[PDB]
Amino acid sequence: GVDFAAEVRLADDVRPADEVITTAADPKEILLTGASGFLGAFLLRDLMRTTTARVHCLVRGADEAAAMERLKANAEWYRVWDDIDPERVSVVLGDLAEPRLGLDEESFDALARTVDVVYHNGARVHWLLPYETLKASNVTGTEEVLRLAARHRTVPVHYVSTVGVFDGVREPGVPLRVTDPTGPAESLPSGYLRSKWVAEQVIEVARDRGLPVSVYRVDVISGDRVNGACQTRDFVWLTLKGLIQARSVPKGTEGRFHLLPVDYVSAAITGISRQPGTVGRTFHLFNQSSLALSQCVELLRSLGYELDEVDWDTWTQVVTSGDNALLPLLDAFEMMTSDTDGFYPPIDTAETVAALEGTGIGIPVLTRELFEKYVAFFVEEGHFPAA
Ligand SMILES: NC(=O)C1=CN([C@@H]2O[C@H](COP(=O)(O)OP(=O)(O)OC[C@H]3O[C@@H](n4cnc5c(N)ncnc54)[C@H](OP(=O)(O)O)[C@@H]3O)[C@@H](O)[C@H]2O)C=CC1
Incomplete structure (x- = not known):
């Protein structure tokens, strides 16, 4: 049995730098994880449409050219590559499951110093694999993303999570609130949901240390x-x-x-991430209908x-x-x-509708x-x- 209380720990070097930036209006350099996946393709497209920034995409692969082709082919399958500006796409060869994201010193330091905001969307989503197998990508990888965002100059992390971190409803018929207790891990039915729960808990420690981290718990994503x-x-x-x-x-x-179109999710996450007074908060993305x-x-x-x-x-x-x-x-x-x-279980989305008031996003x-x-x-x- 896994001692999940002991898994909730953040390495003591992950702390705010002297300079802590809490917003990212008009970002110039963005780090996006998971861009070679489903939501990530749409996050990449929406960042192209909503910023003028270069978007560094952490992608696994043998070399940059092969990784780029993987990113491209994924975006083409989801039919968003035509909406992406390849001149603004920068492939960062690396791996969420290895130390310092598999980067060399020069790349780690440069991203840590110059990325204005991180969208931490990448994870290993497998409904059967045990927590132990998913920890490196989903928990340690999240710690490594937090390490990079914090080090040298601290910038915000926008972390994609799941409403599945909840074990059912707190009080019958009452929509689950962003502040409600999650887990316990042992009550969650899959290693995958347990890994996301741990990541969230690791993020709570980061938040307690002064690190700016927003969390977007997403329900089931359907097509654009x-x-x-x-x-x-x-x-x-x-x-x-x-x-x-x-x-x-x-x-x-x-x-x-409860279908949630992927292009709503991407627009919501990116949109909330720029709205005022949202940094450091947790949001539920869930279709009442x-x-x-x-x-x-x-x-x-x-x-x-x-x-x-x-x-x-x-x-x-x-x-x-x-x-x-x-x-x-x-x-x-x-x-x-x-x-x-x-x-x-019913899920409260009031903070989400309120933050998206007037954004045209629905x-x-x-x-x-x-x-x-x-x-x-x-x-x-x-x-x-x-x-
Ligand atoms: N219904 C849904 O899809 C929901 C999704 N989410 C969250 O959405 C986010 C996107 O997941 P989704 O798009 O659905 O799943 P995908 O499997 O389509 O995207 C997964 C992404 O994670 C990346 N990834 C996984 N492991 C590694 C690794 N070790 N190193 C680098 N990159 C890695 C994959 O890269 P590669 O191409 O190399 O595998 C891919 O880009 C996840 O955080 C998930 O928890 C939350 C709730 C619902």
């Missing part, structure tokens, strides 16, 4: 509202994919999905997919018979449908058109079968 571009391996779309594959759905089974499971099924039926209603046993035997995206998620699908309110409505864009993206990219 323009092209529908979305990662493939999340519970929502694998659930719907499984139903499509099984060509059926269990009778009398209802649930919901949802699409019911029955709504998704009806929408898929209207697109031409065969989804016959069958008894639970017949359905689960189809799913467990092989080649079905839901098979490893059957337990989660059953928990979500049998106690949906328990599965999706969650899109979950329309039929939006849903159809989502399915169309997966069908074109080969992730969903055609109807």
Whole structure:
């Protein structure tokens, strides 16, 4: 068993420099981690649109040219590369899982001295791996990012977290507040969520030492509202994919999905990060609105997919018979449908709506058109079968 109370520690060298900058209006040099991933591609695009800064992107790879091509191909898959200015993209070859982010002395020192703000979005998101395996990327990597931001000149870190650090609701029916206790780690169902919980706790120590660190706890991210571009391996779309594959759905089974478009998340995080009086605070990004499971099924039926209603046993035997995206998620699908309110605790977002007042930034409505864009993206990219 992991002693999670002992895992909450920040190396004593991670402390504010003599100069501490708490805002980053009009930044000139930005460090972004996780730019070769889903949210990171949209964070990169939005920083291009909302600053004039060069964006140093920490990317793993053999050499800068190969890392650049990885970053590019990811952005092209999400259909945002055309919105990015490559002349403002600077690849920083490194690794969240190794000391000083895998940088050499010259690069570490130069970024520590000159980056105006850090968006710490990179992490290893694996729903099964144990905490011990994810610690280096997700916890120690966060400590290393904090080390870099703090050293020489202290600049703000904007850390992407998850509403999953909560173990359900504090008081029934009361939306979870940004100040509410999280964890305990042992109550969280995955090593991944436990690693994010530890990172947050490490960040609380940094905050207690005077280091400027904002935290954005994000819920499930769905595709962008323009092209529908979305990662493939999340519970929502694998659930719907499984139903499509099984060509059926269990009778009398209802649930919901709180979809949060990725381009809302990127715009919100970057937008809040410039709003006044937000540095050092924690924010919840969560869509109060949802699409019911029955709504998704009806929408898929209207697109031409065969989804016959069958008894639970017949359905689960189809799913467990092989080649079905839901098979490893059957337990989660059953928990979500049998106690949906328990599965999706209410989340308070008032601080988030207030900070975004007047920014033009808002969650899109979950329309039929939006849903159809989502399915169309997966069908074109080969992730969903055609109807
Ligand atoms: N539904 C969601 O997607 C949600 C996401 N989040 C948070 O969003 C952030 C983005 O995750 P998401 O975009 O979803 O997942 P992705 O897997 O798409 O992005 C993960 C990113 O982390 C980077 N990364 C992982 N390990 C390392 C490493 N050792 N060294 C350097 N870079 C590394 C990956 O780089 P490479 O390409 O080299 O793997 C990739 O750029 C994460 O902090 C996650 O916790 C929170 C809540 C919900």
